[PDB]
Amino acid sequence: MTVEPFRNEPIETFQTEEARRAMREALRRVREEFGRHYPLYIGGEWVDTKERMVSLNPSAPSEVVGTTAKAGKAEAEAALEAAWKAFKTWKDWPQEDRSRLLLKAAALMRRRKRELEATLVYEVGKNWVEASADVAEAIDFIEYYARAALRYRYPAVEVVPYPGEDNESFYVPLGAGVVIAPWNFPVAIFTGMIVGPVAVGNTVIAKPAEDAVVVGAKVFEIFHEAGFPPGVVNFLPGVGEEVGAYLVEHPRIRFINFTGSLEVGLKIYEAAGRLAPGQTWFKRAYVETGGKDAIIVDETADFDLAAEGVVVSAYGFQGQKCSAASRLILTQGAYEPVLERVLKRAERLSVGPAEENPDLGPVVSAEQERKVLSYIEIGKNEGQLVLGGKRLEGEGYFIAPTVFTEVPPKARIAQEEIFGPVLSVIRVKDFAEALEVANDTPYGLTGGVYSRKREHLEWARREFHVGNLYFNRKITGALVGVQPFGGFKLSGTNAKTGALDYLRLFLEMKAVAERF
Template identity: 55%
Template sequence: MQQAYKNEPFTDFSKKENRDDFQTALNEVEQQLGKHYDIIIRGERIRTKKTGTSINPSNIEEVIGTVSQADKSLAEQAIHTAVETFETWKKVKPSARARYLYKASAILRRRKHEFSAWLVKESGKSWAEADADTAEAIDFMEYYARQIEKLTSRHPLTRLTGEDNELYYVPLGVGIVIPPWNFPLAIMAGMTTAAIVSGNTVVLKPASTTPVIAAKFMEILDDAGLPEGVVNYIPGSGSEIGDVLVEHPLTRFISFTGSREVGLRINELAAKHQPGQKWMKRVVAEMGGKDSIVVDHDADLELAAQSIVASAFGFSGQKCSACSRAIVHEEVYDEVLARVVALTKEITVGDIREYGLYTGPVVDQQAYDKILSYIEIGKTEGKLMIGGEKGSDKGYFIQPTVFADVDPQARLMQEEIFGPVVAFAKAKDFDHALEIANNTEYGLTGAVISRNREHLEKAREEFHVGNLYFNRKCTGALVGVHPFGGFNMSGTDSKAGGPDYLQLFTQAKLVSELL
């Protein structure tokens, strides 16, 4: 048995030697920009005429790379390859599958700054956010490797004289993994390796805006010696291959992280029985949030303001866990709002390649246009306190934006914006604050800042979210520490990074023998 799990530490960029090392990695990655990346099916690299282009959101003139795009026939080929490979991969001992993850995590740890540099360039993450993303990818692989060893050990059952009974977990089959662009390494790696360490094979369709990072991760799996065909990399548009992958009768499960709209469509398509299909498909989905930080009248107000700003504007608010709603008791509303505005004024936005910047661009033109449209809506629904403007035209920059006095039912308080926008609503008392916090269709994360133990216990019972935090920000879940997933339209509450996660990719089998 491996040693006890411990989270990968974050890099301390206050040390000059660490900054120099990261700068070197950035320089080396910049020398590799503009390359082409092929589709990979059973280890074979396939180049297609149709390609997609990944660009740097901090500098839209800079091409990160071009990527071959799969069509329906290649999607079909990838699924059949995964089906064939499953017959051998499922027979590999769980401990041996775990060792592939230990090896991959060790390789990634050695290439940590390199992958973080790719995250800076392709997804627009700050140095700190990119470093955390890479650390989380390492954490996911090591955690799931340890979890499969626990899951596949003998489970104690009630003894019955004259019988030998054993419960064990077997893999499902072929899974379609559709990761998000906002954690293009951590969540992608976590979803993929959880499926394969459980004995399944995978067709990986990377996010269209961050396919290069996924291609680089395929290098890690190859270096770790993972057998060909266990993971098949097929970039492509959702409209071209998405439905084919989800609806295919040989697809056993779909692991998805993304928008509510796409998640619901996947769930609908997966629920329809196809000719030749032998099972009900399993859907593991995380679909976003509309997350609130509640501030009580007796709270530490500096902590509250710092938590709101960090949760709302880290990575330009492009986290499903980001705070987009600040619900503040009327007695301290003005003070908290003023402090949040003051802190927001200090935020620096720009080309995130520079170390000193707090946050950078939003991911692409579509996100840019959507967020700016919500800012215009916000101007009609509340009072613009700060921000609301574009940044440099060199990239997709939007200034961190705070709206005050927003009605709890307003669009700004109900719809997921996924950008650097936070809306303030005033609560009459703590019960009213919880009522507002629960008034959305989502239920992912939330936080309560309060010194009142009775109120915290009330929130523990009544604040209906999958991840609830007291007296801290609502972002920053750690693998194995804060199993992550939400209620309602936030998805299936899959609890990634938790002890139950691998059971979603397996099924329990009982064997009973009369002695």
């Protein structure tokens, strides 16, 4: 199979009238459909349950954006049976055939871009550009993994020949596994975590995050229309830990693909290490578990450029990103000029209902609001509040862009992932101390440096110990293919998404010799 070389899907800026019109149209269609109910998807069919889950608009939480079915253990078991039944034949599809199926899915998703974006706006409180980036990244994962999977096709392994024998090594998929997806990128990461394993012949049971069950269902509409065989992909929205625990601990779950909090990731990894009664394999668990990401600025930087990148990085999608800049490390010569610019920019940010395309929408939920406000209370005891730090008026979960200064590097707000619009500013003596402070957290996901000094940039290239490092630009928005995404340390298992290496995680190798 021959397709155009991979290119990233353009992110819509909505700078044209047509783009704005198209979005208004999509927002209207989505809200007219707020009454919809979305069942589970098991074995190629939509399957309803007695109990339901409600999804809320975080910009107006009295407004319901949809309802879904609610899976329990019985539905998880049915999905698992379906996934293994499907695996028996799906594994034997030619790679070309599986990759074409993905390409079809990407084409369908592209045709529904505005609808998915508008659903992100209403369901998880993304502004318009954040919503478009999310959907574009989802499309990218599908396009990229469809092509990358062909690099592993039968028989892909380079071996040394031996006289009088054929020696043939090749990759085979693992089996049925479970995907536990986040609320913050519920099209992009939801899709990537599913289609990567599926592309190479695995089957998947996907549990969406509770806050993003509607958009997850709409992604499953796309999978169904694309024509994935029954059991290949399954959709199990659920409340709390029931469904996830049941599957993670199950003797017949082959692998676990997880993106979310460290608390949950640590539990998953520990469980995956155990042999459940009757289990006949060593489980693989891939976890991406957040960050406490810093931007360093030194006295040689373009301070205006730095301030812009810091504000984008800290406050994009309300700081609810594993990649978000939650620490700003300033050398002495950079401190005042950069802090003054950051404050001037941040104080001009709009906050309001996501559909109005504000700089910040609401945080995602009452629980998220509670967590972020609690960290703000902690921060007032650790650092100096200089901007924001309060809830804004309205039932929507609106929190003001927040800055703490004079934060000790070992303060809770300088160590713990807040996942809200809260930036901690740390003053350091020089670039060496900046790196020391940057590295001294349990995490290692993203980081950035603003500097014109070549020796500082290259030193950071070697010693700023994060999986995704960026110089003189924002530290968020890793592009599929361009920036393999994944971290070090307690940021997870370094499963690099949007990279050739990702697919290898979902394969095992067989070596077959014939002596003639």
